[PDB]
Amino acid sequence: MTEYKLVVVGAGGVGKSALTIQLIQNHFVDEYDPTIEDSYRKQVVIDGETCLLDILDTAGQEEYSAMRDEYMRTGEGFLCVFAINNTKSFEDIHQYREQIKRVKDSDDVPMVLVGNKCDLAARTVESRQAQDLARSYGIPYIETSAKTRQGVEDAFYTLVREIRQH
Ligand SMILES: Nc1nc2c(ncn2[C@@H]2O[C@H](COP(=O)(O)OP(=O)(O)NP(=O)(O)O)[C@@H](O)[C@H]2O)c(=O)[nH]1
Ligand SMILES: [Ca+2]
Ligand SMILES: [Mg+2]
Ligand SMILES: [Mg+2]
Ligand SMILES: [Mg+2]
């Protein structure tokens, strides 16, 4: 069957692990354990196609971000995640995109910009700002909550549909 290699990147604490765990395991991780590099695999049907998702959950913490570029160059599509209540994580996005362009050696890499923690009221990044950033990259913007599950499937499946247009 078709395998899609997805990689989730973004600043420490924005909810990369929680998103992935909600998608694959259907529960919300409330605690914060910083990731080094973890892998998840799951067979799913997306738009009628049975396929295998291989998801790399990467470190956001600079202290844990060793050899991240190595694990990443194998990725086919990337979720670039920031948190809507963390302005710095949004500002950090451009540098994750640059890293991806480097590891893939291409300006045309399947990506989705994800604004996570949309269940939270302390918003400092407005939807329109994120829409504009995504538009400049030529990619979708989707808001998610790993807590409520809002947009979680949408984000990952959209990433798959982006790889498919590639
Ligand atoms: N309210 C809320 N909290 C969230 C959401 N996603 C993650 N969190 C919380 O934010 C914290 C960090 O989440 P985590 O998934 O560990 O972040 P990470 O990006 O994987 N961190 P790291 O880069 O260090 O591995 C946890 O306490 C988690 O419960 C969300 O959508 N809503
Ligand atoms: Ca929990
Ligand atoms: Mg993590
Ligand atoms: Mg390179
Ligand atoms: Mg503002």
Swiss-Prot record:
Palmitoylated by the ZDHHC9-GOLGA7 complex. A continuous cycle of de- and re-palmitoylation regulates rapid exchange between plasma membrane and Golgi. The keyword DNA-binding does not apply. It is an enzyme of class 3 (hydrolase). This is GTPase HRas. Changing N26G: Loss of interaction with PLCE1. Changing G12V: In CSTLO, bladder carcinoma and CMEMS; constitutively activated; interacts and recruits PLCE1 to plasma membrane. Involved in the activation of Ras protein signal transduction. Ras proteins bind GDP/GTP and possess intrinsic GTPase activity. It is found in: Cell membrane; Golgi apparatus; Golgi apparatus membrane. It comes from Homo sapiens (Human). Alternates between an inactive form bound to GDP and an active form bound to GTP. Activated by a guanine nucleotide-exchange factor (GEF) and inactivated by a GTPase-activating protein (GAP). A motif (Effector region) lies at residues 32-40. Its main location: membrane. Glycans are attached at T35. Widely expressed. Changing T35S: Loss of interaction with PLCE1. It catalyses: GTP + H2O = GDP + phosphate + H(+). GO terms for cellular component: ciliary basal body; cytoplasm; cytosol; endoplasmic reticulum membrane; glutamatergic synapse; Golgi apparatus; Golgi membrane; GTPase complex. Changing G13R: In SFM; somatic mutation; shows constitutive activation of the MAPK and PI3K-AKT signaling pathways.
